[PDB]
PDB file of C-alpha atoms and ligand atoms in Angstrom:
ATOM      1  CA  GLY A   1      93.351  76.317 161.388  1.00 23.97           C
ATOM      2  CA  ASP A   2      93.933  78.046 158.070  1.00 22.51           C
ATOM      3  CA  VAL A   3      93.156  81.710 158.661  1.00 22.03           C
ATOM      4  CA  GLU A   4      93.125  82.468 154.948  1.00 22.80           C
ATOM      5  CA  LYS A   5      90.388  79.939 154.317  1.00 24.68           C
ATOM      6  CA  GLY A   6      88.656  81.085 157.504  1.00 28.89           C
ATOM      7  CA  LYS A   7      88.679  84.587 156.113  1.00 29.48           C
ATOM      8  CA  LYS A   8      86.862  83.417 152.932  1.00 31.09           C
ATOM      9  CA  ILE A   9      84.401  81.465 155.047  1.00 34.45           C
ATOM     10  CA  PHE A  10      83.741  84.544 157.206  1.00 34.49           C
ATOM     11  CA  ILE A  11      83.169  86.790 154.190  1.00 31.76           C
ATOM     12  CA  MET A  12      80.723  84.401 152.541  1.00 32.02           C
ATOM     13  CA  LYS A  13      78.799  83.284 155.626  1.00 29.86           C
ATOM     14  CA  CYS A  14      79.033  86.094 158.253  1.00 29.86           C
ATOM     15  CA  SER A  15      80.361  89.416 156.882  1.00 32.15           C
ATOM     16  CA  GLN A  16      76.958  90.484 155.612  1.00 31.89           C
ATOM     17  CA  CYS A  17      75.886  90.772 159.287  1.00 32.20           C
ATOM     18  CA  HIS A  18      79.139  91.088 161.299  1.00 34.10           C
ATOM     19  CA  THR A  19      82.326  93.148 161.255  1.00 29.95           C
ATOM     20  CA  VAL A  20      85.422  91.970 163.143  1.00 30.97           C
ATOM     21  CA  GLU A  21      87.799  94.952 163.226  1.00 29.25           C
ATOM     22  CA  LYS A  22      88.399  97.184 166.210  1.00 28.35           C
ATOM     23  CA  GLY A  23      85.696  99.842 166.169  1.00 28.35           C
ATOM     24  CA  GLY A  24      83.902  98.276 163.249  1.00 28.31           C
ATOM     25  CA  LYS A  25      80.246  99.055 162.929  1.00 31.35           C
ATOM     26  CA  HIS A  26      77.289  97.126 164.274  1.00 29.99           C
ATOM     27  CA  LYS A  27      75.241  95.857 161.320  1.00 28.25           C
ATOM     28  CA  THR A  28      72.429  93.315 161.422  1.00 26.61           C
ATOM     29  CA  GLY A  29      74.629  91.602 164.030  1.00 29.97           C
ATOM     30  CA  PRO A  30      77.098  92.944 166.591  1.00 29.32           C
ATOM     31  CA  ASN A  31      80.690  93.767 165.890  1.00 26.78           C
ATOM     32  CA  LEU A  32      82.785  90.840 167.093  1.00 27.35           C
ATOM     33  CA  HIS A  33      86.052  92.542 168.043  1.00 27.99           C
ATOM     34  CA  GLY A  34      87.241  91.437 171.455  1.00 31.22           C
ATOM     35  CA  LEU A  35      84.838  88.497 171.302  1.00 33.22           C
ATOM     36  CA  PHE A  36      87.266  85.918 172.673  1.00 30.44           C
ATOM     37  CA  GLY A  37      86.882  85.828 176.471  1.00 30.95           C
ATOM     38  CA  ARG A  38      83.809  88.084 176.542  1.00 32.60           C
ATOM     39  CA  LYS A  39      80.503  86.974 177.993  1.00 35.26           C
ATOM     40  CA  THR A  40      77.616  86.624 175.548  1.00 33.00           C
ATOM     41  CA  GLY A  41      75.629  89.745 174.795  1.00 34.02           C
ATOM     42  CA  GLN A  42      78.302  92.212 175.833  1.00 37.72           C
ATOM     43  CA  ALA A  43      79.294  94.044 172.623  1.00 37.71           C
ATOM     44  CA  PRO A  44      79.012  97.760 173.582  1.00 34.16           C
ATOM     45  CA  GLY A  45      76.348  99.675 171.727  1.00 34.46           C
ATOM     46  CA  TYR A  46      74.528  96.667 170.299  1.00 31.91           C
ATOM     47  CA  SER A  47      70.869  96.095 171.118  1.00 31.18           C
ATOM     48  CA  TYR A  48      70.587  92.374 171.756  1.00 30.77           C
ATOM     49  CA  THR A  49      67.251  90.664 171.910  1.00 31.09           C
ATOM     50  CA  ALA A  50      66.010  88.753 174.890  1.00 31.28           C
ATOM     51  CA  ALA A  51      67.970  85.558 174.174  1.00 32.95           C
ATOM     52  CA  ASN A  52      71.829  85.945 174.063  1.00 34.63           C
ATOM     53  CA  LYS A  53      72.066  88.116 177.208  1.00 34.24           C
ATOM     54  CA  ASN A  54      70.708  85.462 179.611  1.00 35.08           C
ATOM     55  CA  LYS A  55      73.521  82.955 178.985  1.00 37.22           C
ATOM     56  CA  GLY A  56      76.453  83.541 181.379  1.00 37.38           C
ATOM     57  CA  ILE A  57      78.667  81.797 178.783  1.00 37.30           C
ATOM     58  CA  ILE A  58      82.125  83.047 177.749  1.00 38.31           C
ATOM     59  CA  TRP A  59      82.898  83.047 174.053  1.00 33.27           C
ATOM     60  CA  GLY A  60      85.955  81.049 173.082  1.00 33.43           C
ATOM     61  CA  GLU A  61      87.220  78.373 170.728  1.00 27.91           C
ATOM     62  CA  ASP A  62      85.103  75.671 172.343  1.00 29.25           C
ATOM     63  CA  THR A  63      81.850  77.663 172.705  1.00 28.61           C
ATOM     64  CA  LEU A  64      82.198  78.978 169.182  1.00 28.38           C
ATOM     65  CA  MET A  65      82.683  75.389 167.992  1.00 27.25           C
ATOM     66  CA  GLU A  66      79.483  74.266 169.660  1.00 27.69           C
ATOM     67  CA  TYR A  67      77.632  77.372 168.504  1.00 25.40           C
ATOM     68  CA  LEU A  68      78.548  76.809 164.827  1.00 23.22           C
ATOM     69  CA  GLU A  69      77.923  73.064 165.049  1.00 24.52           C
ATOM     70  CA  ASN A  70      74.273  73.306 166.170  1.00 24.16           C
ATOM     71  CA  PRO A  71      73.161  76.886 165.640  1.00 28.11           C
ATOM     72  CA  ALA A  72      69.417  76.152 165.836  1.00 27.52           C
ATOM     73  CA  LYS A  73      69.798  75.069 169.464  1.00 26.61           C
ATOM     74  CA  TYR A  74      71.335  78.384 170.519  1.00 29.37           C
ATOM     75  CA  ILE A  75      70.448  81.233 168.122  1.00 32.31           C
ATOM     76  CA  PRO A  76      67.397  83.355 169.017  1.00 31.18           C
ATOM     77  CA  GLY A  77      64.317  83.591 166.840  1.00 30.65           C
ATOM     78  CA  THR A  78      65.378  86.927 165.356  1.00 30.49           C
ATOM     79  CA  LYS A  79      68.676  85.657 164.028  1.00 28.89           C
ATOM     80  CA  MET A  80      67.024  82.429 162.867  1.00 31.44           C
ATOM     81  CA  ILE A  81      64.713  84.511 160.671  1.00 30.79           C
ATOM     82  CA  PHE A  82      67.536  86.686 159.266  1.00 28.75           C
ATOM     83  CA  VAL A  83      69.735  83.690 158.610  1.00 23.72           C
ATOM     84  CA  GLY A  84      66.917  81.761 156.947  1.00 22.86           C
ATOM     85  CA  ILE A  85      66.314  84.735 154.684  1.00 24.48           C
ATOM     86  CA  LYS A  86      69.977  84.807 153.621  1.00 26.19           C
ATOM     87  CA  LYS A  87      70.021  81.030 153.089  1.00 23.10           C
ATOM     88  CA  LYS A  88      66.908  81.207 150.887  1.00 21.93           C
ATOM     89  CA  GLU A  89      68.655  83.803 148.654  1.00 22.34           C
ATOM     90  CA  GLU A  90      71.886  81.751 148.587  1.00 20.69           C
ATOM     91  CA  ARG A  91      69.936  78.687 147.469  1.00 21.70           C
ATOM     92  CA  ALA A  92      68.251  80.559 144.645  1.00 19.07           C
ATOM     93  CA  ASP A  93      71.583  82.009 143.527  1.00 17.35           C
ATOM     94  CA  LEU A  94      73.263  78.555 143.667  1.00 15.19           C
ATOM     95  CA  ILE A  95      70.473  76.946 141.665  1.00 13.91           C
ATOM     96  CA  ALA A  96      70.619  79.780 139.179  1.00 15.45           C
ATOM     97  CA  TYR A  97      74.339  79.228 138.761  1.00 16.57           C
ATOM     98  CA  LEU A  98      73.896  75.473 138.430  1.00 16.56           C
ATOM     99  CA  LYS A  99      71.230  75.713 135.743  1.00 16.46           C
ATOM    100  CA  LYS A 100      73.652  77.887 133.796  1.00 16.59           C
ATOM    101  CA  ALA A 101      76.956  76.101 134.483  1.00 14.40           C
ATOM    102  CA  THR A 102      75.753  72.528 134.072  1.00 16.60           C
ATOM    103  CA  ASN A 103      74.123  73.345 130.700  1.00 15.75           C
ATOM    104  CA  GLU A 104      77.018  75.373 129.211  1.00 13.76           C
TER     105      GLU A 104
ATOM    106  CA  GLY B   1      68.866  84.499 140.871  1.00 14.37           C
ATOM    107  CA  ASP B   2      72.382  85.930 140.788  1.00 15.29           C
ATOM    108  CA  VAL B   3      74.546  83.504 138.799  1.00 13.75           C
ATOM    109  CA  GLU B   4      77.808  85.169 139.805  1.00 12.65           C
ATOM    110  CA  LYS B   5      77.043  84.930 143.501  1.00 12.48           C
ATOM    111  CA  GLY B   6      75.851  81.375 142.844  1.00 13.52           C
ATOM    112  CA  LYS B   7      79.290  80.556 141.472  1.00 12.65           C
ATOM    113  CA  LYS B   8      81.004  81.775 144.641  1.00 14.96           C
ATOM    114  CA  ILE B   9      78.665  79.690 146.761  1.00 17.37           C
ATOM    115  CA  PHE B  10      79.401  76.666 144.578  1.00 17.06           C
ATOM    116  CA  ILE B  11      83.159  77.090 144.859  1.00 18.16           C
ATOM    117  CA  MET B  12      82.977  77.417 148.646  1.00 18.37           C
ATOM    118  CA  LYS B  13      80.395  74.746 149.339  1.00 20.20           C
ATOM    119  CA  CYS B  14      80.501  72.157 146.480  1.00 23.41           C
ATOM    120  CA  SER B  15      83.532  72.451 144.203  1.00 23.54           C
ATOM    121  CA  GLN B  16      85.730  70.359 146.505  1.00 21.75           C
ATOM    122  CA  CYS B  17      83.618  67.309 145.567  1.00 23.71           C
ATOM    123  CA  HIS B  18      81.917  68.318 142.306  1.00 25.92           C
ATOM    124  CA  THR B  19      82.764  69.654 138.873  1.00 26.94           C
ATOM    125  CA  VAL B  20      80.088  71.160 136.611  1.00 25.63           C
ATOM    126  CA  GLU B  21      81.814  71.357 133.237  1.00 27.54           C
ATOM    127  CA  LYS B  22      81.183  69.075 130.258  1.00 30.08           C
ATOM    128  CA  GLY B  23      83.653  66.230 130.479  1.00 32.02           C
ATOM    129  CA  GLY B  24      84.649  67.432 133.902  1.00 32.67           C
ATOM    130  CA  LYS B  25      86.154  64.908 136.254  1.00 31.68           C
ATOM    131  CA  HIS B  26      84.372  62.774 138.799  1.00 30.44           C
ATOM    132  CA  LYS B  27      85.792  63.588 142.187  1.00 26.06           C
ATOM    133  CA  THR B  28      84.432  62.613 145.599  1.00 23.46           C
ATOM    134  CA  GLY B  29      81.067  63.324 144.037  1.00 20.60           C
ATOM    135  CA  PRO B  30      79.826  63.050 140.465  1.00 24.76           C
ATOM    136  CA  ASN B  31      80.342  65.644 137.761  1.00 23.91           C
ATOM    137  CA  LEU B  32      77.094  67.570 137.495  1.00 23.76           C
ATOM    138  CA  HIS B  33      76.955  68.619 133.869  1.00 22.64           C
ATOM    139  CA  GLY B  34      73.594  67.944 132.248  1.00 20.28           C
ATOM    140  CA  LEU B  35      72.019  67.315 135.716  1.00 18.69           C
ATOM    141  CA  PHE B  36      68.781  69.230 135.040  1.00 15.43           C
ATOM    142  CA  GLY B  37      66.148  66.880 133.742  1.00 16.29           C
ATOM    143  CA  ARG B  38      68.225  63.816 134.575  1.00 18.19           C
ATOM    144  CA  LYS B  39      67.154  61.113 137.013  1.00 18.76           C
ATOM    145  CA  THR B  40      69.052  60.606 140.254  1.00 21.10           C
ATOM    146  CA  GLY B  41      72.028  58.251 140.060  1.00 20.20           C
ATOM    147  CA  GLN B  42      72.725  58.529 136.313  1.00 22.26           C
ATOM    148  CA  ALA B  43      76.002  60.408 136.039  1.00 23.18           C
ATOM    149  CA  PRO B  44      77.923  58.205 133.546  1.00 25.65           C
ATOM    150  CA  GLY B  45      81.154  56.691 134.836  1.00 28.71           C
ATOM    151  CA  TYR B  46      80.438  57.416 138.517  1.00 29.04           C
ATOM    152  CA  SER B  47      80.241  54.798 141.316  1.00 26.26           C
ATOM    153  CA  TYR B  48      77.333  55.710 143.610  1.00 25.89           C
ATOM    154  CA  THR B  49      76.159  54.077 146.821  1.00 27.59           C
ATOM    155  CA  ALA B  50      72.629  52.762 147.294  1.00 25.10           C
ATOM    156  CA  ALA B  51      70.806  55.664 148.945  1.00 25.06           C
ATOM    157  CA  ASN B  52      70.243  58.027 145.999  1.00 27.26           C
ATOM    158  CA  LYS B  53      69.878  55.592 143.077  1.00 27.87           C
ATOM    159  CA  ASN B  54      66.553  53.995 141.928  1.00 29.00           C
ATOM    160  CA  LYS B  55      64.586  57.020 143.184  1.00 29.54           C
ATOM    161  CA  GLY B  56      62.782  58.003 140.033  1.00 29.81           C
ATOM    162  CA  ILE B  57      63.359  61.609 141.064  1.00 32.08           C
ATOM    163  CA  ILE B  58      64.294  64.004 138.266  1.00 32.63           C
ATOM    164  CA  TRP B  59      66.727  66.767 139.182  1.00 31.35           C
ATOM    165  CA  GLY B  60      65.497  70.281 138.522  1.00 31.26           C
ATOM    166  CA  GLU B  61      65.036  73.700 140.098  1.00 30.35           C
ATOM    167  CA  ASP B  62      62.522  72.431 142.690  1.00 27.76           C
ATOM    168  CA  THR B  63      64.182  69.110 143.595  1.00 26.19           C
ATOM    169  CA  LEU B  64      67.534  70.804 143.897  1.00 26.81           C
ATOM    170  CA  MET B  65      65.909  73.432 146.133  1.00 23.70           C
ATOM    171  CA  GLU B  66      64.442  70.717 148.377  1.00 25.81           C
ATOM    172  CA  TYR B  67      67.820  68.916 148.490  1.00 27.32           C
ATOM    173  CA  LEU B  68      69.533  72.032 149.816  1.00 27.54           C
ATOM    174  CA  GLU B  69      66.684  72.683 152.277  1.00 26.99           C
ATOM    175  CA  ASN B  70      66.245  69.081 153.521  1.00 26.19           C
ATOM    176  CA  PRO B  71      69.404  67.080 152.748  1.00 25.28           C
ATOM    177  CA  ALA B  72      68.202  64.158 154.878  1.00 25.76           C
ATOM    178  CA  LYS B  73      65.664  63.451 152.119  1.00 26.93           C
ATOM    179  CA  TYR B  74      68.470  62.795 149.690  1.00 27.32           C
ATOM    180  CA  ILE B  75      72.013  62.415 151.004  1.00 28.06           C
ATOM    181  CA  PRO B  76      73.306  58.979 151.903  1.00 28.15           C
ATOM    182  CA  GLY B  77      75.259  58.285 155.049  1.00 27.98           C
ATOM    183  CA  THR B  78      78.456  58.203 152.994  1.00 30.39           C
ATOM    184  CA  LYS B  79      77.980  61.745 151.791  1.00 30.50           C
ATOM    185  CA  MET B  80      76.875  62.861 155.281  1.00 32.93           C
ATOM    186  CA  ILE B  81      80.273  61.765 156.548  1.00 30.45           C
ATOM    187  CA  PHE B  82      82.205  63.493 153.757  1.00 30.57           C
ATOM    188  CA  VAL B  83      80.279  66.721 154.299  1.00 28.51           C
ATOM    189  CA  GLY B  84      80.556  66.563 158.090  1.00 28.94           C
ATOM    190  CA  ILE B  85      84.314  66.138 157.738  1.00 28.41           C
ATOM    191  CA  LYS B  86      84.387  69.209 155.515  1.00 26.47           C
ATOM    192  CA  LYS B  87      82.234  71.315 157.861  1.00 27.86           C
ATOM    193  CA  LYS B  88      84.512  70.510 160.804  1.00 28.71           C
ATOM    194  CA  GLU B  89      87.542  71.734 158.850  1.00 27.66           C
ATOM    195  CA  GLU B  90      85.550  74.832 157.947  1.00 24.77           C
ATOM    196  CA  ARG B  91      84.657  75.492 161.563  1.00 23.26           C
ATOM    197  CA  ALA B  92      88.299  75.229 162.616  1.00 26.32           C
ATOM    198  CA  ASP B  93      89.497  77.577 159.880  1.00 24.17           C
ATOM    199  CA  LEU B  94      86.734  80.093 160.684  1.00 23.94           C
ATOM    200  CA  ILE B  95      87.513  79.976 164.407  1.00 23.92           C
ATOM    201  CA  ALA B  96      91.243  80.405 163.690  1.00 18.76           C
ATOM    202  CA  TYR B  97      90.495  83.379 161.477  1.00 19.50           C
ATOM    203  CA  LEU B  98      88.212  84.929 164.075  1.00 19.14           C
ATOM    204  CA  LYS B  99      90.751  84.562 166.894  1.00 20.17           C
ATOM    205  CA  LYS B 100      93.176  86.463 164.682  1.00 23.50           C
ATOM    206  CA  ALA B 101      90.813  89.086 163.226  1.00 24.67           C
ATOM    207  CA  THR B 102      88.849  89.860 166.405  1.00 27.04           C
ATOM    208  CA  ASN B 103      92.151  90.444 168.281  1.00 27.19           C
ATOM    209  CA  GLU B 104      93.875  92.747 165.707  1.00 25.54           C
TER     210      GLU B 104
HETATM  211  C1  HEC C 201      79.223  83.201 160.423  1.00 21.45           C
HETATM  212  C2  HEC C 201      79.346  81.680 160.641  1.00 21.45           C
HETATM  213  C3  HEC C 201      78.715  83.913 161.693  1.00 21.45           C
HETATM  214  C4  HEC C 201      79.296  83.900 162.900  1.00 21.45           C
HETATM  215  C5  HEC C 201      80.629  83.229 163.254  1.00 21.45           C
HETATM  216  C6  HEC C 201      78.509  84.713 163.779  1.00 21.45           C
HETATM  217  N1  HEC C 201      77.414  85.172 163.055  1.00 21.45           N
HETATM  218 FE1  HEC C 201      75.896  86.227 163.890  1.00 21.45          FE
HETATM  219  N2  HEC C 201      74.418  87.442 164.789  1.00 21.45           N
HETATM  220  C7  HEC C 201      73.418  88.033 164.034  1.00 21.45           C
HETATM  221  C8  HEC C 201      72.484  88.688 164.927  1.00 21.45           C
HETATM  222  C9  HEC C 201      71.198  89.483 164.597  1.00 21.45           C
HETATM  223  C10 HEC C 201      73.020  88.418 166.321  1.00 21.45           C
HETATM  224  C11 HEC C 201      72.427  88.883 167.653  1.00 21.45           C
HETATM  225  C12 HEC C 201      71.221  88.044 168.021  1.00 21.45           C
HETATM  226  C13 HEC C 201      70.702  88.562 169.341  1.00 21.45           C
HETATM  227  O1  HEC C 201      70.137  89.664 169.394  1.00 21.45           O
HETATM  228  O2  HEC C 201      70.862  87.891 170.364  1.00 21.45           O
HETATM  229  C14 HEC C 201      74.215  87.648 166.142  1.00 21.45           C
HETATM  230  C15 HEC C 201      74.995  87.191 167.170  1.00 21.45           C
HETATM  231  C16 HEC C 201      76.179  86.531 166.989  1.00 21.45           C
HETATM  232  C17 HEC C 201      77.081  86.120 168.020  1.00 21.45           C
HETATM  233  C18 HEC C 201      76.889  86.377 169.517  1.00 21.45           C
HETATM  234  C19 HEC C 201      77.635  87.684 169.714  1.00 21.45           C
HETATM  235  C20 HEC C 201      77.697  88.137 171.156  1.00 21.45           C
HETATM  236  O3  HEC C 201      78.255  89.217 171.263  1.00 21.45           O
HETATM  237  O4  HEC C 201      77.234  87.476 172.134  1.00 21.45           O
HETATM  238  C21 HEC C 201      78.116  85.537 167.437  1.00 21.45           C
HETATM  239  C22 HEC C 201      79.355  84.918 168.095  1.00 21.45           C
HETATM  240  C23 HEC C 201      77.907  85.539 166.019  1.00 21.45           C
HETATM  241  N3  HEC C 201      76.697  86.144 165.769  1.00 21.45           N
HETATM  242  C24 HEC C 201      78.774  84.971 165.102  1.00 21.45           C
HETATM  243  C25 HEC C 201      73.324  88.007 162.653  1.00 21.45           C
HETATM  244  C26 HEC C 201      74.037  87.189 161.778  1.00 21.45           C
HETATM  245  C27 HEC C 201      73.701  87.001 160.406  1.00 21.45           C
HETATM  246  C28 HEC C 201      72.501  87.786 159.837  1.00 21.45           C
HETATM  247  C29 HEC C 201      71.696  87.114 158.744  1.00 21.45           C
HETATM  248  C30 HEC C 201      74.611  86.181 159.835  1.00 21.45           C
HETATM  249  C31 HEC C 201      74.715  85.704 158.360  1.00 21.45           C
HETATM  250  C32 HEC C 201      75.564  85.843 160.868  1.00 21.45           C
HETATM  251  N4  HEC C 201      75.169  86.470 162.034  1.00 21.45           N
HETATM  252  C33 HEC C 201      76.657  85.017 160.757  1.00 21.45           C
HETATM  253  C34 HEC C 201      77.505  84.699 161.782  1.00 21.45           C
HETATM  254  C1  HEC C 202      77.117  72.089 147.304  1.00 21.79           C
HETATM  255  C2  HEC C 202      75.963  72.620 148.185  1.00 21.79           C
HETATM  256  C3  HEC C 202      76.720  70.748 146.648  1.00 21.79           C
HETATM  257  C4  HEC C 202      75.733  70.479 145.773  1.00 21.79           C
HETATM  258  C5  HEC C 202      74.761  71.467 145.073  1.00 21.79           C
HETATM  259  C6  HEC C 202      75.783  69.085 145.471  1.00 21.79           C
HETATM  260  N1  HEC C 202      76.786  68.520 146.214  1.00 21.79           N
HETATM  261 FE1  HEC C 202      77.227  66.542 146.374  1.00 21.79          FE
HETATM  262  N2  HEC C 202      77.702  64.511 146.310  1.00 21.79           N
HETATM  263  C7  HEC C 202      78.776  64.002 146.978  1.00 21.79           C
HETATM  264  C8  HEC C 202      78.755  62.560 146.835  1.00 21.79           C
HETATM  265  C9  HEC C 202      79.750  61.558 147.403  1.00 21.79           C
HETATM  266  C10 HEC C 202      77.529  62.255 146.023  1.00 21.79           C
HETATM  267  C11 HEC C 202      77.037  60.875 145.600  1.00 21.79           C
HETATM  268  C12 HEC C 202      76.284  60.299 146.776  1.00 21.79           C
HETATM  269  C13 HEC C 202      75.816  58.944 146.332  1.00 21.79           C
HETATM  270  O1  HEC C 202      76.631  58.010 146.180  1.00 21.79           O
HETATM  271  O2  HEC C 202      74.599  58.845 146.097  1.00 21.79           O
HETATM  272  C14 HEC C 202      76.940  63.538 145.739  1.00 21.79           C
HETATM  273  C15 HEC C 202      75.788  63.743 145.052  1.00 21.79           C
HETATM  274  C16 HEC C 202      75.265  64.945 144.715  1.00 21.79           C
HETATM  275  C17 HEC C 202      74.097  65.071 143.902  1.00 21.79           C
HETATM  276  C18 HEC C 202      73.352  63.885 143.276  1.00 21.79           C
HETATM  277  C19 HEC C 202      74.045  63.690 141.947  1.00 21.79           C
HETATM  278  C20 HEC C 202      73.393  62.652 141.046  1.00 21.79           C
HETATM  279  O3  HEC C 202      73.973  62.494 139.948  1.00 21.79           O
HETATM  280  O4  HEC C 202      72.340  62.021 141.382  1.00 21.79           O
HETATM  281  C21 HEC C 202      73.870  66.358 143.733  1.00 21.79           C
HETATM  282  C22 HEC C 202      72.708  66.973 142.927  1.00 21.79           C
HETATM  283  C23 HEC C 202      74.871  67.089 144.488  1.00 21.79           C
HETATM  284  N3  HEC C 202      75.711  66.208 145.084  1.00 21.79           N
HETATM  285  C24 HEC C 202      74.971  68.432 144.601  1.00 21.79           C
HETATM  286  C25 HEC C 202      79.727  64.712 147.659  1.00 21.79           C
HETATM  287  C26 HEC C 202      79.709  66.032 148.003  1.00 21.79           C
HETATM  288  C27 HEC C 202      80.603  66.720 148.896  1.00 21.79           C
HETATM  289  C28 HEC C 202      81.768  65.989 149.596  1.00 21.79           C
HETATM  290  C29 HEC C 202      82.152  66.413 151.020  1.00 21.79           C
HETATM  291  C30 HEC C 202      80.314  68.040 148.826  1.00 21.79           C
HETATM  292  C31 HEC C 202      80.820  69.239 149.667  1.00 21.79           C
HETATM  293  C32 HEC C 202      79.115  68.157 148.062  1.00 21.79           C
HETATM  294  N4  HEC C 202      78.825  66.931 147.519  1.00 21.79           N
HETATM  295  C33 HEC C 202      78.435  69.329 147.818  1.00 21.79           C
HETATM  296  C34 HEC C 202      77.385  69.499 146.950  1.00 21.79           C
END
């Protein structure tokens, strides 16, 4: 994969709620440093909600791929609400941009 | 409705297949200039497939909003494939970025 494009994807779609760097802060979501090979729900200092902890799954390329591919199946209600809030704002911003750009 | 954020979303999520500018090129998808207030399937010069045309739907703020919220209502199988191909590439670039950034 192209890490430079992946960086832009991460900024746009995740960085509002997650940091990746060693010792980076917990925000809406947990810091993700050390994620690869860690069991779900094991970021130190982050208060997970009921669903995430009870998996027994190890994060890696393949589990991330399945996670991202059908998030609704696996994300808990809390994150679903936060994500839906961000997606509603993104839609309104996109439509705002389109009504400007396509009529300029 | 933040037009500048809307632009960034458009670049990331749509600009591979769409232009918005007057006289802008048709690419995988139709140029979008003048979209608002136009019926579905009426971009001049563009070769559509069946499942979009002859709707009688007029594009606007609300129909665009529903499109983004419920794409199954509007996107044909052809576009589903193009978008699914794109999302897979996105997932691989994001995962590649994460395996670098979360291990730095
Ligand atoms: C962009 C595509 C991403 C990616 C790759 C991830 N997120 Fe999130 N995340 C958020 C919250 C509140 C949680 C915890 C939910 C709970 O309490 O159980 C998470 C959790 C994750 C994980 C699991 C981490 C673990 O340590 O087990 C992963 C891998 C993850 N996220 C990746 C919050 C958000 C958002 C808030 C609106 C947004 C946007 C994202 N996350 C985006 C992404
Ligand atoms: C980013 C979220 C967007 C937005 C806002 C739109 N698209 Fe696409 N698009 C693609 C193709 C092949 C078509 C034609 C499908 C067919 O033959 O019917 C479209 C169509 C649209 C429309 C309808 C346009 C019309 O004139 O009726 C609209 C409003 C629209 N798009 C907006 C192809 C793609 C992609 C290829 C992988 C990508 C990505 C997008 N479109 C993204 C977006």
